[PDB]
Amino acid sequence: MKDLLNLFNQQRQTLDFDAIKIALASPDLIRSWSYGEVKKPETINYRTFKPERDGLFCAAIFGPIKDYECLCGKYKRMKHRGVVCEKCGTEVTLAKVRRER
Amino acid sequence: SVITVGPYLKLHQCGLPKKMALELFKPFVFAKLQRRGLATTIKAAKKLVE
Amino acid sequence: NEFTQISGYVNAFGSQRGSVLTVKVENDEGWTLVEEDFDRADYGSDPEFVAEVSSYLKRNGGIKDL
Amino acid sequence: HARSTGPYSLVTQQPLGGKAQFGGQRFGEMEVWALEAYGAAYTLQEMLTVKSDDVQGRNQMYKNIVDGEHEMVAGMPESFNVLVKEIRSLAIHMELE
Amino acid sequence: VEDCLEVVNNRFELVMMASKRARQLANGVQPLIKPTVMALREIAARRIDNALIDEVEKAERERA
RNA sequence: AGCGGAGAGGUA
DNA sequence: GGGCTAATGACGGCGAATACCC
DNA sequence: GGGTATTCGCCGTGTACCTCTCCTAGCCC
Ligand SMILES: [Zn+2]
């Protein structure tokens, strides 16, 4: 929701390239680009404000809704990075990861 | 803004409102207040501006 | 929480206790010289909140980037 | 009205529009052509990337103005990243070579 | 802006030369006689050329 | 608490 | 009232697709 | 075989600003 120490992370990307190439997409490229599949259409759960598991707005596929936090609250600190849970496996990374993958 | 003809100015210069000049050049005002030493932090300089 | 480095400088390291931010410059022995607090919700601007910390870690004897 | 620092959106890292909610004035499509007719690539790159669209340049230019140094960093905007992530969702491979 | 049209033939080369001159006065360089008007006066006074700018840039790179 | 899209009216 | 539960008042230009007299 | 003759479908139509309201909805207790 709110990040403070992430604002001063300067010089993170260079983006040095020469050309732009476009072609068709192989199915293996689509299977390697993604991080999981979806099976139940539900973008917002009702009577509680939590993302639906394996839905349109999911946490086990894309990432966490809150920065450096998980869904349940077992790992709620910045000292734990890259450690997923067991009942709701979310990578404890930055909030920028929800736009890339 | 709304344009208004002014005859007492040269063709290499133009007019500008004071509140617009304060709101546009506000980081330069903050840098000048930091360089002159009249305000320690940017919060005190912003409170002195407002 | 625990003290986490900014990784924009080599001298100072800060923390975050919710919606407020605090920093503390330190020498090679680990002794704190100055320590203040900043409110991000009171400012209402992200680059001004960046420049606040970047000036507080500049005027109070802060070592720049390597 | 006037503004220097305002709110940004979620899809593209751009300021809003209008006198309400602190929205900056839209740089038109023909204004970019009028700027490019003069040449002046330095005032066209600084008014398109480091002013509004970049998520790091918008802080770095403010830090350089408040501090006093003059060293800008050029990079790709976030809107091109949103466009290539939208094109990649159409089973069409597009990679920045 | 009118005197600088006679010392150089290209306007964009004049803009790039004044941009290379403006990166030195910000870090602190004693002037010849706002940094923009001072750099334009130093260009129009027929004192600052492409060799002296390279000399001060090499001295800054050696004294960095 | 910031961020969205439609319909109508008005100035240049 | 309530709480989850799922039209026909546009107009011009250009490229493919049968198809009809030759 | 064959070389156009209608015919169907796709493409598009200026810029910027100011103000107001209204949006997912519905159905048998
Ligand atoms: Zn969890």
UniProtKB/Swiss-Prot annotation, chain A:
Lineage, broadest ranks: Bacteria, Pseudomonadati, Pseudomonadota, Gammaproteobacteria, Lysobacterales
Binding site for Zn(2+) 1: C70, C72, C85, C88
Subunit organization: The RNAP catalytic core consists of 2 alpha, 1 beta, 1 beta' and 1 omega subunit. When a sigma factor is associated with the core the holoenzyme is formed, which can initiate transcription.
Record-given protein name: DNA-directed RNA polymerase subunit beta'
Native source species: Xanthomonas oryzae pv. oryzae (strain PXO99A)
Free-text function comment from the UniProt entry: DNA-dependent RNA polymerase catalyzes the transcription of DNA into RNA using the four ribonucleoside triphosphates as substrates.
Parent-record interval covered: 1 to 101 of 1405
Family according to the record: Belongs to the RNA polymerase beta' chain family.
From Swiss-Prot, chain D:
Function: DNA-dependent RNA polymerase catalyzes the transcription of DNA into RNA using the four ribonucleoside triphosphates as substrates.
Organism of origin: Xanthomonas oryzae pv. oryzae (strain MAFF 311018)
Annotated gene: rpoB
Quaternary structure, from the entry: The RNAP catalytic core consists of 2 alpha, 1 beta, 1 beta' and 1 omega subunit. When a sigma factor is associated with the core the holoenzyme is formed, which can initiate transcription.
Membership in a protein family: Belongs to the RNA polymerase beta chain family.
UniProt protein name: DNA-directed RNA polymerase subunit beta
Top-level taxon in the UniProt lineage: Bacteria
